[PDB]
């Protein structure tokens, strides 16, 4: 049966000559889905193996002596530790970029981003830039709550205004998580009991700006819990985000399991959670609703990283398996709908992220609200269909089937009213909208609609409005791109100059002579002026011989004469 995830084994490190003993937190590092760096010791000689994930078949064994080696999340740049001596080294250029010797030993280090490596000593946290000649900069002092802890991770939000250090320690046959949440702006720290955490940018329903969320999981004093909270003051004109606290499930057999890693997918707005035993967890970032749970590994997955391409999580376990889990975009909505049986979440998910497979639900929600008498909300459902699913003529036909009530009218009127607020109305919607408006002496509303440019025009609307006010029809015809019907309007109303200017701009060529004859018929004086415009240099709109015999037909000999003499003076 279907599952909302896509689990994959990318490679087995044992198949690349990697020693099983070196497959561990202390000797193996993964800072991104791009490289895996292992520290091994061959025959009394210490070396560093870097595995390019684009070309994993052929690993490079370079002879490097370091107590720690971490690659750049993208660049072929490595950072190596030797005692208290740090060094950012260019792999491709075999040249040293930067260097620093620390007073107190660096107990943990990670790449915060491309060009930034964070350093953790027993007393403080530093940020060391790969660029320039800048020394490591102190960010904050380590909290007493984290004293004696084994530092397992360090994270920051996008804007890097919030920093987070995580450490764990063994207290009474339980691994206890200690975190320090430091705010750069407020310059203060908050100690938090948490095992795994992550930051996320999330824009709420009806919110102007993106909210910065802090999400952490723990198996602590109140058992397994997942918290989703907004950090700091919300931007001007925002809601804020209501704090979430949900349970994290640990089966009875897994009594010494706890959260080990967490990655949040901004794309689908879901939280990935990996526990010590190898269980994966899937949560909705918005509500903290659990979606999928499963054991994917028999061995602990000690290192994790975001799987950038698929917007998922990629880790490595003690067995040497390089595992990858991500959202299966084709199956997530059906699964939430039918296997999880959580329609409300499926609906929210399909509209939030533009995912597909929700159609039956939108129809159900519509038919239910239609039967409910609530036509106002029923319209909103049709309006916020993921890919214009309920924005069809059948919908309008349904709304047309309901009457005008005593003054509460009309559900079709209501449907259109909210619809234009979302975007531009389609050709058919515009047609059905104006029909009852034009029907009883009301045309001014069109002026606002057309000036605001909220509806899409084709020809069928123009001849419909032309039926009462042909001057307004010209505006419709103009936007509809139909030149034939635009020139026709200028011709009925005698505006000859605009006929020529328009046809020259849009490149449309009409039957100039036939237009001349029409002009000549109604009023010859205008005829002669029009004849003048038809012949001007390089590109003449009409044949000169053809226009003069038109003059002759009406026996306009004197004006024909005048026309030609004028034509000579304009050529001079």
């Amino acid at each position: 049966q279907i599952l909302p995830i896509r689990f994959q084994e990318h490679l087995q490190l044992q198949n690349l000559g990697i020693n099983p003993a070196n497959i561990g937190f202390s000797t193996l590092t993964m800072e991104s889905d791009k490289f895996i760096c292992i520290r091994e010791k061959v025959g009394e000689q210490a070396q560093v193996v870097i595995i390019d994930m684009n070309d994993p078949s052929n690993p490079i064994r370079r002879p490097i002596s370091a107590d720690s080696a971490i690659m750049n999340p993208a660049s072929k740049v490595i950072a190596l530790k030797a005692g208290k001596t740090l060094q950012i080294f260019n792999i491709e250029m075999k040249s040293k970029m930067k260097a620093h010797t620390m007073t107190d030993d660096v107990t943990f280090w990670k790449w915060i981003s491309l060009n930034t490596v964070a350093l953790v000593t027993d007393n403080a946290v530093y940020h060391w830039s790969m660029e320039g000649e800048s020394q490591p900069v102190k960010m904050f002092d380590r909290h007493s709550s984290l004293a004696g802890c084994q530092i397992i991770n360090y994270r920051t939000d996008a804007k890097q205004k919030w920093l987070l250090l995580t450490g764990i320690s063994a207290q009474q046959n339980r691994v206890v998580g200690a975190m320090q949440l430091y705010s750069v702006d407020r310059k203060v720290s908050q100690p938090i009991e948490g095992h795994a955490a992550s930051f996320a940018q999330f824009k709420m329903e009806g919110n102007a700006e993106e909210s910065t969320l802090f999400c952490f999981a723990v198996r602590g004093q109140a058992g397994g819990k997942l918290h989703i909270i907004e950090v700091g003051t919300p931007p001007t004109g925002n809601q804020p985000f209501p704090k979430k606290a949900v349970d994290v499930f640990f089966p009875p057999e897994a009594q010494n399991d706890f959260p080990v890693a967490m990655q949040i997918s901004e794309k689908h707005d879901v939280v990935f959670l990996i526990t010590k035993y190898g269980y994966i967890h899937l949560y909705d970032l918005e509500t903290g609703t659990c979606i999928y749970m499963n054991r994917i590994s028999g061995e602990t997955i000690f290192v994790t990283a975001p799987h950038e391409a698929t917007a998922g999580i990629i880790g490595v376990n003690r067995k040497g398996q390089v595992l990858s889990v991500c959202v299966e975009e084709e199956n997530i909505i059906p699964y939430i709908t039918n296997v999880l049986q959580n329609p409300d979440l499926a609906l929210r998910m399909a509209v939030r992220n533009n995912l597909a497979g929700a159609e039956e639900l939108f129809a159900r929600k519509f038919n239910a609200l239609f039967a409910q008498g609530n036509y106002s909300e029923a319209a909103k459902v049709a309006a916020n269909a993921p890919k214009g699913i309920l924005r069809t003529p059948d919908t309008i036909r349904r709304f047309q089937s309901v009457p005008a009530q005593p003054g509460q009218t009309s559900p079709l009127l209501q449907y259109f009213g909210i619809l234009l607020d979302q975007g531009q109305l389609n050709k058919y919607e515009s047609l059905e909208l104006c029909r009852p408006v034009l029907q009883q002496g009301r045309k001014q509303l069109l002026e606002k609609w057309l000036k605001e440019d909220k509806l899409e025009c084709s020809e069928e609307l123009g001849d419909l409005v032309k039926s009462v006010d042909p001057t307004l029809a010209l505006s419709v015809y103009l936007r509809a791109n139909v030149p034939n019907k635009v020139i026709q309007c200028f011709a009925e109303t005698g505006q000859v100059q605009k006929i020529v200017l328009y046809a020259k701009k849009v490149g449309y060529t009409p039957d100039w002579i036939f237009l001349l004859r029409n002009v000549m018929r109604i009023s010859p004086d205008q005829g002669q002026q029009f004849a003048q415009m038809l012949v001007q240099d390089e590109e003449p709109l009409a044949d000169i011989t053809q226009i003069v015999d038109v003059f002759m037909e009406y026996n306009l000999i004197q004006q024909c004469t005048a026309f030609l003499l004028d034509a000579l003076k304009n050529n001079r």
């Binding site: 000036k451 505006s475 635009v486 849009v506």
Partner: peptide
């Protein structure tokens, strides 16, 4: 991208507007 810009100039010259 560039089409809408030349379009607005056109409506200004011929369509009745006001």
């Amino acid at each position: 991208k560039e089409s809408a810009l030349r379009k607005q100039s056109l409506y200004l010259k011929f369509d009745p507007l006001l």
